[PDB]
Structure formats: structure tokens, C-alpha cells
Design a protein around this ligand. Structure first.
Ligand code: FAD
Ligand code: PEV
Ligand code: SF4
Ligand code: F3S
Ligand code: FES
Ligand code: FES
Lengths: 239, 264, 594
């Protein structure tokens, strides 16, 4: 069933743009990126996409497929009826560069603010001993293809621009969590997770866990534990 | 404008581009919470039909009965405070603490932040609020005391368990008979919901760095995490069981028969 | 254009590129990192194997000698023996220092790193974490870079005092002084503006060439740059005819087109091998591909250009879901194809190129210049075939070697070379040529599709001399039609422009591959001839090198036949027995036997 789809792609730059209507043959069993590549090859050669690989192990092909932040290389195009319109727009949290490519730089300058892994300053490289149950908690957060869909959907930064300076986002609080749960790390980071990176701005309305392609339990496994660990230090009257 | 209409973001003049029925979950949450709160606040203040003096049933909405205005036999821990002035519920000891425990719950917080406060109604729908401070200012910084209402909930669950255990008495000795089944199921599900708490998961073993150094707390943390993966289910399940238990007991206290297996 | 003066430029942030950046920074130098894509989204994230390292965590009879023997056996004794020795005896330390950067592998019952079994390896070697090992490696290296520049911020006073990352920047030419590297010209993908890095040393570490083939499991960036960059700058390529294929990997559903199908599924119901599956399973995969192409060229070739490999009239519904769990989940969630109900559409995908820039073993590449290479873009290791896991520890080992060699070359440099303007002018002119009217125009995508079709059809798994020069003759007309390519639009992130720029690298690496595969008249590992089925001639001490005689944008190549260095000093072990060496070597040992 190779029907003709009805698309609506946001075309424009930082000066303004529109949703334009296109018509593309959709063969059976192919993702949105295939339709976008067909569109580039036959109709609009200069359409910005920013893909790298086609398996979902990257984070390059993030967009908003029908109002939902998704990877373009994983959205099956069978989710949608043959008679309904598919509306592809860039991520609506970050500044737009061109048609479907946004400027993901906020979450690269947020990366070099979180203290990094520090081991004990006597241990040698061949002498690290960790048990599997100790590394299990952090190995889940290390599955993070940096899609930044979590950073896109968070209403703290998505709906309020003045909170970009105060909130680091779900991705960079999961980073703090997995550095805190590392069995060999040394720095605390519990005070700064609340005072510097504004962990308190997250209400627990998950909304992030709902968009992670890797199915990381961001809120239940990283954000609520860190909130409890900060309550231990600041809000526990047992002293 | 404010958040997705800012001058530097993509120019879509739409609150959301979602085409699904994204407003259904907040509506259902609102209706469920409203129905439960209305029922609970009417029943707790009715002041009657809470005690079967024969088979010794007591409603969870009247769990510790510490007044001398209670039905003779109802007080299991003693009668301490006189009679109350008609606007203090007969279970003023436990109902404030249960309400606080469910209010400062990491799941219920998500539910009503989405539904009532209109912090994101759905996942990617434009928020109607202009300024946002999260749980950082005064009234919402107090949600971090959930771990003490968790201890209160443990104690209240122990009281409920004692009541359900002594509810096994027919007039002629031991007894059974479907009031016991409902009370016991309600207590067991209350225990499950209490042990599914994120504060329980943190206090038992979630705060440790080395699990290999703690074999018992690792086991407890594993089991509590398996339970906690479904904390959302047990909240609603326990609301429903509370309603059903109170309803059945009220019907039996006022009038219907109790379906017993041991004589009266 | 904007100009940046540095000490080293690393064109690529993968495994090799990032390890080289780390090592060059701690040797003490100012390093620029140029990436075609975002930071940390290289092709390494797709690797799902492990790092072959003789750490002796599982069983202690392992060694670097048995690892060296395994690497030489798997490459059919065509490997660069020095690079293989070096990788064998240095791979444990690289993996051990990865976990001091924050990496978390899978652990044993003792706390050491857990190691898997693989085909070519005699002992359990592959250090892994689940099935995401390249992701762990690239995350570790990226976060270690960020740690280093946090230290720079704390002590020197700026985040980018030593290391600066120019992600989403494409390099198009290498500026030369008098034969020595003097810079690197490129453009920003976002703005289309021109950048000139003025550095005396360059570490390529770019990657593969997999986008020249129709069916392939390679990223968008694998357009063959790095190879073409070094080639048309000053250097030579070796072993370009050794490309690793896999006779399976779904071809039709474009959602799953480069996704390799292992042999485990073929350890059951299969395609066809004259019996038992219509078992003649497991017969050498070169013969599997011979049968596939014999049934495709003259037979019931399916509309997608492949074969079925049906498993439905087999273990009915439940045994598949558990015997092949991840494949099943991936297919059902991606292509909406349930393997318990449907037949696949598999064909000869392209995976890895085992040739590349002819590097020096100890320090990295280059004849005249200060050019260095590491990773997949280099050649000499993985002689004719590669082992699983070697490609991922090779990255660490020789990225560190390249960083150290670049550091020493910069430190021992009397006067720095300086770029000329009469070469930045030519670079700008070539990169802006596709923005002209160009009567009787072409299209980047049409030319790319034609190149992919021709390469996949005629220079595929099993080659023939009569049809490997047909491709050589049609590449001439394709490069003649490239002279009229036109791009529509401006320079602000115009992927048609980017494709028109990368076509001139694809057209060079394709000519290299075809001209080498025509001249190597013997079958060995990744290069299967047909009129020369006699495996393993004395085309062993011969490298079949490639260099650019002379021209302009798409330059004509020439292929020469140089010898290799006298094989091994005492690296003729006893693990290497005569009964095994005499199957590969000329009767030239005269020393080996005790
Ligand atoms: C699907 C797949 C699975 C694999 N699985 C395994 C496995 O299990 N085990 C194993 O050992 N090996 C595996 N490999 C091979 C292995 O990943 C390679 O050896 C390794 O990934 C090569 O990486 P690299 O360091 O050479 O550079 P890459 O990581 O490939 O990236 C090169 C970098 O250079 C940049 N670049 C390229 N061109 C330019 C330019 N013109 N200007 C500027 N920058 C540029 C790119 O943006 C990219 O960041 C696999 C390969 C693939 C494709
Ligand atoms: C089954 C039981 C489950 C419970 C179900 C019940 C349903 C509850 C529904 C009602 C709760 C909904 C709350 C949703 C958020 C609304 C609260 C809120 O946001 O506070 C606002 C209203 O607060 C005020 O401004 C006024 C507060 C002053 C009142 C003075 C006395 C109140 C102090 C209470 C003391 C606490 C008592 C301790 C009990 C635990 C202020 O906004 P903000 O601080 O969050 O800023 C963010 C964006 N600007
Ligand atoms: S967390 Fe899940 S969603 Fe947020 S970035 Fe990492 S992967 Fe994408
Ligand atoms: S979306 Fe934002 S608000 Fe909290 S749970 Fe996820 S972070
Ligand atoms: S392209 Fe790599 S994730 Fe979609
Ligand atoms: S009760 Fe739900 S988190 Fe404590």
C-alpha cells in the first residue's frame, strides 16, 4: 500500500516561517526520515534535517512529529492513518537555525558546569574493583543517547525563558544522579544540585520519562532520589 | 510572548500541534479526586453508621475512636477527649495525617500539578502561566516533608491492621463473613501502597552508595523498587478500596445483613 | 573567513579523534577538534561489540602473544605486523585507563571487567557493557574532554584555553606550505561561512567510505573524506580493495537497510543451499555471497534486490521471540515486521573498509607533511580481514599514538609553516563552484544515487575483471557529469551543497577501490575475485598502493605495487607453527624452524 501522504513541514529561519504542504509516496514499513529524504531527493533539496545514522543510537534526528517530541528515524509512519496529515516542526524549546534544525548549545554549555567524575587520588588504573550491583544503578543512566527530547519537553525551560539560566534540565540532573551513585566517585554535588542547577524547579510531573527513546526512568530513578538526597541535607529536621 | 512564542524560537502560533485527546487524563483525574474528596468529607462528618457492635467492624474513616461519644465498644485504644463540637471529625487523629500523606505524595503531586495547577496540562501543550518558580518558594518547599507523613502512615497502617485483626469476632466466638474479607483486603492494599512510597525506597536502601556492603538492605530495596514501579496503580486502588469498605460497613451498620460464616 | 591559530587540528571526534585530543592536550598543546556532526554523535555510538584486550580477567592463559597470533590469522597474514604487535601489547592499558575516566563496564564476580567470547578470538577478550560499548566509549571520551576543559577553566582561566571543539564544521581542503601541512580550510554547516585553522600538524581520524555503496550500514558522514583529503594533499592509500561485507542485512524496508543479520539466525531455517532449509549452513560466507549473487543475477531476485531468509516455517512463534530477542523487538518496533510471521529481505551489506592512509606504525602517517592518521581512516592493521573488537581498541591505541606523535612533531619543529592566500582562494573557488548556472545542469542526489547503484552492483562482494572495469569506465562519465552539478538555494545549511561537496570525495575513493580491486589478482579475506579463486598467492608481501598522479577537483589516481618489510623479527612464535605459516608464506622463512 504505497499511498501518497499529506505532509506539513515547518520551513523557515530565525526570521519567521510557515508550515508548507507536500505530497510524498509512502511505501509500507518506513520511518519519517525516509519520507524526509525522499522529499529532499525529489522536491526540496535544501531542506534542513540533521540526521547522522538511522538506528536510534544518536540524538541527531529529534523533531516534533505531530506535536510530540520524537526521533525521526524511529517514528514508524504507520502510527498515522493513510488519510491524515503529518505535521513536522523543529523542537520548539531551542532557537531555530533553519527548517528543521535547532541550535542545541544551551545543553552543551550546561555540560561543562557539572563537576566531572573524580576517582581517589591514589588508585591505579588496573586496580578498580566494583561489583555489578554497585554499577547497576548508574549503568541505566549511561544509556543516554543525547537526544535532548527530555530537555525539549520540560515545561520549566520550554514555557519559561527566564528559567534557562536557573534550571539545568532533566538530562543534566540525571547526569548528577549517576555521578552521585557511582561507587568510586568522591565529590558530593548534593548541595549544588539544588543551589546552582535548580533541582527544586522540577515538579514531578514526569513528562520527560514519556519522551525518552531509551526508556530511562528519569523521574523515578534519578530525579526523585536526588530530591530525597537533597532533603536529607537541607530539609530533614533530624539534627 | 512568553514560552514558545519567544522571538528566537520557531514561529508556530499554536498552543500545541497535538491532534489527540490530550485533555482526557486531567479531566479523569479531576473527576476521580473530586468524587473521592466529596465522599470522604461527607462520610467522615456524618457521625453515624460506622460500627457493627456484633461482628466488630469499624470504618477506616473512623480508625482511632478517642471520644466518649463513640458507640460502646468502638474505642480500641481508650476514650480521651470528651465530646467534639460537630465540626471536628470523630477520627480527627488519623484523617489529617492520611490526607497530608496523600497530599504530599510524589504521584499525587504530579496528578494535581497537571490537573489543577495547569502546570503542564499535557506533555507539550503551552502552559497558561507566565511565571514559574517550581517547588522552590514557601508554600511548595514544604512538600519535602513527605518522609515524615510516611512514618505517620506506617503508624496509621498499624492501627488499621490491629482493627482489621480484631474484627474477626462473631457474638459466639470466632467469626468470618465478608466484612472481614473487605476489611482485610483494604488493609493489605493500604500496606502495599504505603510500602510502594518513594520515601520508603529511599530510606530503606536507596540512600546507600555500596549495595555489595549491605546484603539485607539491598534485598529490601530490590523488592520495594519492584513494588514502587506501580505506585500510580496502588494509589487509585486504595482510594477505591477505602470507598468500598466504608460503603459496605455503612450499609451493614444502618441496614442490610452481613453474610457471615460463623453464627450470631 | 575566520582564522584560528592552533598547534594541532583533529578532523574528527570519534574514538580515535577524541583519544588523540586527550593525549595531545596532556602532552601540552593547543588543540582544535573539528566535527562534521554534533559533539559525541560519531559513528562509534553504533558499535555494539567490545574492546578486544588481553586483560586476562576471565581466564589467565590469555596473552598478548595469542592476541597477536589471532590478529595475524584473521587478517590472513597481510597485516602490518608492527601495528598488530603494538595493538596486542597495548590494548589492556587503554581499556584500563578508560575506567579511570568514569566508564562503567560489566563486572565479574571479582570486580574486574567482564569479557565476552567472539569468533576469531581464542580466549574471552571483548570487554563490554550490555550491547552498547561504542556509546560508553564515546561518552567517556567526551566527558573526559569536558573534564579537561573544566580544569583549564579553573587553572588557566578559560574553558577553551587548550581544547576547543568546533562541532558541525566540515573540512574540505588541507593547506600546504611546501609539502608540509600548514592548515585546514573548511566551512560551518550552520552558516555556510569559511574557516581556516592555521596549525602545523593534523590528525585525520575521519572514518569509512560506506556512503559510496547502495546497501551499507554506515552513517551519513561516511562520505570518504579523510581518505580523499590525505590523498589529494600528499599521501598514499593502501589496501583499498579490502572492504568488509556481510552477505546478509535487510535491504528492502528503508527503515532497516543497513542492519546486519548475524549467522545465529541462519543456524536455523535458511535461504537456500541446495538442501535442508528449502543443513548446508555455515559454509564460508564468501560462498554464501556467491550463492546469493548467483541467485540474484540469474534467478528469482526479490524486488528489493535481495533474498528471503525465511524463518516462519520453523520454530513456530515462541522459540523465535526468545532465541533472537533483540532482533525481534527491534524489527517489530521499527519496520513493523514480525519475524515469527514474515520473510526478511536480506542482501550483501557493506560494513568496514580495512584499508586507508598508509601510516607509519609507531608514529602516524605522512610522507613529507606533518600529517597523522588513526582509526578507520588509517591502513595497515586488519590486513585483509578484521576481527570483531579489534576495530574498537585499535581506536584507543592508535589515537593515543597519533596524538603523541603529533605532539613530538610540533615540539621538534624549527619554524612554523604559514598558509598562502593563493590557496585559500582556490579552496573557496572550488567549494563555491556548485553555485553557478552550469548549462545542462545535474543534481547532487541523482549523481549520488547513480554512484551508489554502480558501486553496489559492480564492485560488490564477488568481483570480476570484465565487470570491474565496466564500473571503472562509467566512473569516468560520472566524474565528467559532476562538472555540471548545480545547487539550488543559499549557503545557510544547504544539504544539497554539502552533498555536491562530498561527491568529489566519493568519486576519488571509488576510483581508488576499483583500480586496486582490478589489480589484486587473488582472493583473500575481504576481496573475493572470481576468475582467480585460488586463495592466497604470493600477493602477500605486496601492498598495492594508491596515489594521485595529477589533476583538479576529481583527480586521476595511479596504483603501484610495493613490497612489505621482512615479516617478523622473532615474531615467528611457535604459536606460529610452520604447518600454519607455510600455508600463507613464500618459502622465505629460512629462520623460523627450531
Ligand atoms: C553499524 C556499525 C557497527 C559496528 N560495530 C562494531 C563492533 O561491534 N566492534 C568493533 O570493533 N567495531 C565496530 N564497528 C566499526 C568501528 O565502529 C570503527 O572501527 C570505528 O567506529 C571507527 O571510528 P573512527 O574513530 O574512525 O571515527 P568515527 O567514530 O567513525 O567518526 C569520525 C568522525 O570524523 C568526523 N568527520 C568525518 N569527515 C569529516 C570532515 N570532512 N570534516 C570534519 N570532520 C569529519 C565525523 O563527523 C565523525 O565524528 C562498527 C561500525 C558500524 C558502522
Ligand atoms: C486522595 C487524596 C489526594 C489529594 C487530592 C486533593 C486535591 C488537591 C487539589 C488542590 C491542590 C492543588 C495544588 C496545585 C498547585 C497550587 C499551589 C501553588 O502553586 O501555590 C500558589 C498559591 O500559593 C500562594 O501564593 C498563597 C499561599 C499563602 C497562604 C498562607 C497559608 C498557606 C500555608 C500552608 C501551610 C502548610 C500546612 C502544612 C500541611 C502539610 C503559589 O504559586 P507558586 O508558589 O507555586 O509559584 C509557581 C508559579 N508562580
Ligand atoms: S534522557 Fe532520555 S530523553 Fe532526555 S536525552 Fe537522554 S535519552 Fe533523550
Ligand atoms: S520534564 Fe521537566 S519538570 Fe521534571 S520530571 Fe521531567 S523534568
Ligand atoms: S538518525 Fe541517529 S537517531 Fe535518528
Ligand atoms: S506515597 Fe507516593 S511517594 Fe510516598
Amino acid at each position: 500500500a504505497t499511498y501518497d501522504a499529506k505532509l506539513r513541514v515547518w520551513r523557515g529561519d530565525d526570521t519567521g516561517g510557515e508550515l508548507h504542504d507536500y505530497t510524498v509516496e509512502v511505501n509500507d514499513g518506513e520511518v519519517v526520515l525516509d519520507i524526509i529524504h525522499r522529499l529532499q531527493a525529489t522536491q526540496t533539496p535544501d531542506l534542513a534535517v540533521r540526521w547522522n545514522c538511522k538506528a536510534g543510537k544518536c540524538g541527531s534526528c529529534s523533531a516534533e512529529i505531530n506535536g510530540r517530541p520524537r526521533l525521526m528515524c524511529m517514528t514508524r509512519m504507520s502510527t498515522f492513518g493513510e488519510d491524515e496529515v503529518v505535521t513536522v516542526t523543529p523542537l520548539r524549546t531551542f532557537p531555530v537555525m533553519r527548517d528543521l534544525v535547532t541550535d542545541v548549545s544551551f545543553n552543551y554549555e550546561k555540560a561543562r558546569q557539572i563537576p566531572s567524575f573524580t576517582p581517589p587520588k591514589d588508585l591505579q588504573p588496573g586496580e578498580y574493583r566494583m561489583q555489578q550491583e554497585d554499577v547497576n544503578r548508574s549503568q541505566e543512566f549511561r544509556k543516554c543517547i543525547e537526544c535532548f527530547l527530555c530537555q525539549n519537553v520540560c515545561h520549566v525551560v520550554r514555557d519559561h525563558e527566564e528559567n534557562k539560566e536557573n534550571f539545568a534540565g532533566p538530562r543534566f540532573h540525571m547526569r548528577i544522579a549517576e555521578l552521585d551513585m557511582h561507587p568510586l566517585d568522591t565529590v558530593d554535588r548534593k548541595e549544588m544540585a539544588q543551589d546552582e542547577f535548580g533541582l527544586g524547579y522540577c515538579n514531578i510531573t514526569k513528562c520527560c520519562t514519556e519522551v525518552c527513546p531509551e526508556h530511562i526512568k528519569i523521574t523515578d530513578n534519578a530525579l526523585i532520589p536526588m530530591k530525597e538526597r537533597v532533603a536529607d541535607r537541607k530539609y530533614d529536621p533530624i539534627v | 510572548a512568553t514560552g514558545v512564542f519567544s522571538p528566537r524560537r520557531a514561529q508556530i502560533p499554536e498552543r500545541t500541534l497535538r491532534t489527540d485527546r490530550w485533555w482526557q487524563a486531567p479531566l479523569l483525574t479531576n473527576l476521580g479526586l473530586a468524587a473521592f474528596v466529596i465522599y470522604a468529607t461527607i462520610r467522615a462528618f456524618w457521625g453515624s453508621a460506622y460500627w457493627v457492635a456484633d461482628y466488630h467492624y469499624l470504618t477506616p474513616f473512623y480508625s482511632p475512636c478517642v471520644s466518649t461519644a463513640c458507640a460502646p465498644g468502638s474505642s480500641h485504644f481508650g476514650q480521651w477527649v470528651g465530646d467534639l463540637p460537630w465540626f471536628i471529625p470523630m477520627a480527627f487523629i488519623s484523617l489529617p495525617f492520611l490526607l497530608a500523606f496523600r497530599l504530599t505524595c510524589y504521584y499525587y503531586r504530579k496528578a494535581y500539578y497537571r490537573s489543577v495547577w495547569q502546570s503542564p496540562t499535557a506533555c507539550a501543550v503551552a502552559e497558561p502561566h507566565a511565571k514559574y518558580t517550581g517547588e522552590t518558594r514557601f508554600p511548595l518547599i514544604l512538600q519535602n516533608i513527605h518522609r515524615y507523613f510516611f512514618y505517620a502512615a506506617v503508624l496509621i497502617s498499624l492501627v488499621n491492621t490491629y482493627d482489621a485483626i480484631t474484627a474477626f469476632h462473631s457474638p459466639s466466638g470466632f467469626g468470618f463473613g465478608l466484612g472481614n474479607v473487605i476489611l482485610t483486603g483494604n488493609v493489605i492494599l493500604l500496606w502495599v501502597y504505603t510500602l510502594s512510597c518513594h520515601s520508603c525506597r529511599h530510606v530503606t536502601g536507596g540512600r546507600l552508595k555500596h549495595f555489595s556492603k549491605h546484603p539485607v538492605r539491598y534485598w529490601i530495596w530490590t523488592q520495594v523498587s519492584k513494588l514502587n514501579t506501580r505506585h500510580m496503580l496502588f494509589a487509585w486502588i486504595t482510594l477505591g478500596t477505602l470507598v468500598l469498605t466504608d460503603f459496605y460497613i455503612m450499609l451493614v451498620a444502618s441496614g442490610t445483613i452481613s453474610d457471615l460464616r460463623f453464627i450470631g | 573567513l575566520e582564522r584560528h591559530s592552533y598547534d594541532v587540528v583533529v578532523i574528527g571526534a570519534g574514538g580515535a579523534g577524541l583519544r588523540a585530543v586527550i593525549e595531545a592536550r596532556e602532552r601540552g598543546l593547543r588543540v582544535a577538534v573539528v566535527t562534521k556532526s554534533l559533539f559525541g554523535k560519531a559513528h562509534t555510538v553504533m558499535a555494539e561489540g567490545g574492546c578486544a584486550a588481553a586483560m586476562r580477567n576471565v581466564n589467565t592463559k590469555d596473552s598478548w602473544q595469542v592476541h597477536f597470533g589471532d590478529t595475524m590469522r584473521g587478517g590472513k597474514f597481510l597485516n602490518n605486523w608492527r601495528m598488530a604487535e603494538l595493538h596486542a601489547q597495548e590494548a589492556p592499558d587503554r581499556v584500563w585507563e578508560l575506567e579511570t575516566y568514569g566508564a562503567l563496564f560489566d563486572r565479574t564476580k571479582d570486580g574486574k571487567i567482564s569479557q565476552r567470547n567472539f569468533g576469531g578470538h581464542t580466549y574471552p577478550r571483548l570487554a563490554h557493557v550490555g550491547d552498547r560499548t561504542g556509546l560508553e566509549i564515546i561518552r567517556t571520551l567526551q566527558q573526559k574532554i569536558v573534564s579537561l576543559q573544566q580544569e583549564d577553566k579553573r587553572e588557566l582561566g578559560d574553558y577553551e584555553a587548550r581544547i576547543r571543539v568546533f562541532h558541525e564544521t566540515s573540512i574540505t581542503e588541507l593547506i600546504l606550505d611546501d609539502g608540509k601541512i600548514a592548515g585546514a580550510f573548511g566551512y560551518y554547516r550552520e552558516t555556510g561561512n569559511f574557516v581556516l585553522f592555521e596549525a602545523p600538524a593534523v590528525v585525520l581520524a575521519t572514518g569509512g567510505i560506506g556512503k559510496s555503496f547502495k546497501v551499507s550500514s554506515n552513517s551519513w558522514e561516511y562520505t570518504g573524506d579523510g581518505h580523499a583529503l590525505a590523498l589529494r594533499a600528499g599521501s598514499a592509500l593502501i589496501n583499498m580493495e579490502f572492504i568488509q561485507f556481510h552477505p546478509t542485512g535487510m535491504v528492502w524496508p528503508l527503515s532497516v537497510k543497513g542492519i546486519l543479520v548475524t549467522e545465529g539466525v541462519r543456524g536455523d531455517g535458511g535461504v537456500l543451499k541446495n538442501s535442508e532449509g528449502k543443513t548446508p549452513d555455515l559454509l564460508p560466507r564468501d560462498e554464501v555471497a556467491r550463492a546469493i549473487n548467483a541467485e540474484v543475477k540469474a534467478g528469482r531476485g526479490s524486488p528489493h534486490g535481495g533474498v528471503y531468509l525465511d524463518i516462519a516455517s520453523r520454530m513456530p512463534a515462541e522459540e523465535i521471540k526468545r532465541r533472537l530477542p533483540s532482533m525481534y523487538h527491534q524489527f517489530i518496533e521499527l519496520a513493523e515486521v514480525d519475524i515469527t510471521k514474515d520473510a526478511m529481505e536480506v542482501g550483501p551489506t557493506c560494513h568496514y573498509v580495512m584499508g586507508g592512509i598508509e601510516v607509519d606504525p609507531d608514529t602516524a602517517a605522512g610522507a613529507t607533511p606533518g600529517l597523522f592518521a588513526a582509526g578507520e581512516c588509517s591502513g595497515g592493521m586488519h590486513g585483509s580481514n578484521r576481527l570483531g573488537g579489534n576495530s574498537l581498541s585499535d581506536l584507543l591505541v592508535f589515537g593515543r599514538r597519533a596524538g603523541l606523535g603529533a605532539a613530538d612533531y610540533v615540539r621538534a619543529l624549527p619554524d612554523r609553516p604559514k598558509v598562502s592566500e593563493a590557496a585559500v582562494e582556490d579552496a573557496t573557488r572550488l567549494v563555491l563552484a556548485p553555485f553557478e548556472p552550469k548549462a545542462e545542469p545535474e543534481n547532487p542526489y541523482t549523481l549520488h544515487a547513480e554512484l551508489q547503484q554502480s558501486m553496489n552492483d559492480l564492485v560488490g562482494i564477488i568481483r570480476k575483471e570484465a565487470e570491474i572495469q565496466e564500473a571503472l569506465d562509467r566512473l569516468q562519465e560520472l566524474k565528467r557529469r559532476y562538472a555540471n552539478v548545480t545547487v539550488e538555494g543559499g549557503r545557510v545549511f544547504n544539504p544539497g551543497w554539502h552533498l555536491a561537496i562530498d561527491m568529489r570525495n566519493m568519486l576519488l575513493v571509488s576510483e581508488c577501490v576499483a583500480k586496486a580491486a582490478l589489480q589484486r589478482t587473488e582472493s583473500r579475506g575481504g576481496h573475493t575475485r572470481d576468475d582467480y579463486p585460488e586463495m592466497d598467492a604470493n600477493w602477500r608481501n605486496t601492498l598495492l598502493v594508491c596515489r594521485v598522479s595529477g589533476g583538479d577537483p576529481v583527480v586521476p589516481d595511479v596504483t603501484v605495487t610495493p613490497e612489505q618489510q621482512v615479516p617478523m623479527r622473532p615474531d615467528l612464535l611457535g604459536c606460529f607453527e610452520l604447518s600454519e605459516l607455510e600455508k600463507y608464506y613464500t618459502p622465505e622463512e629460512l629462520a623460523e624452524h627450531p
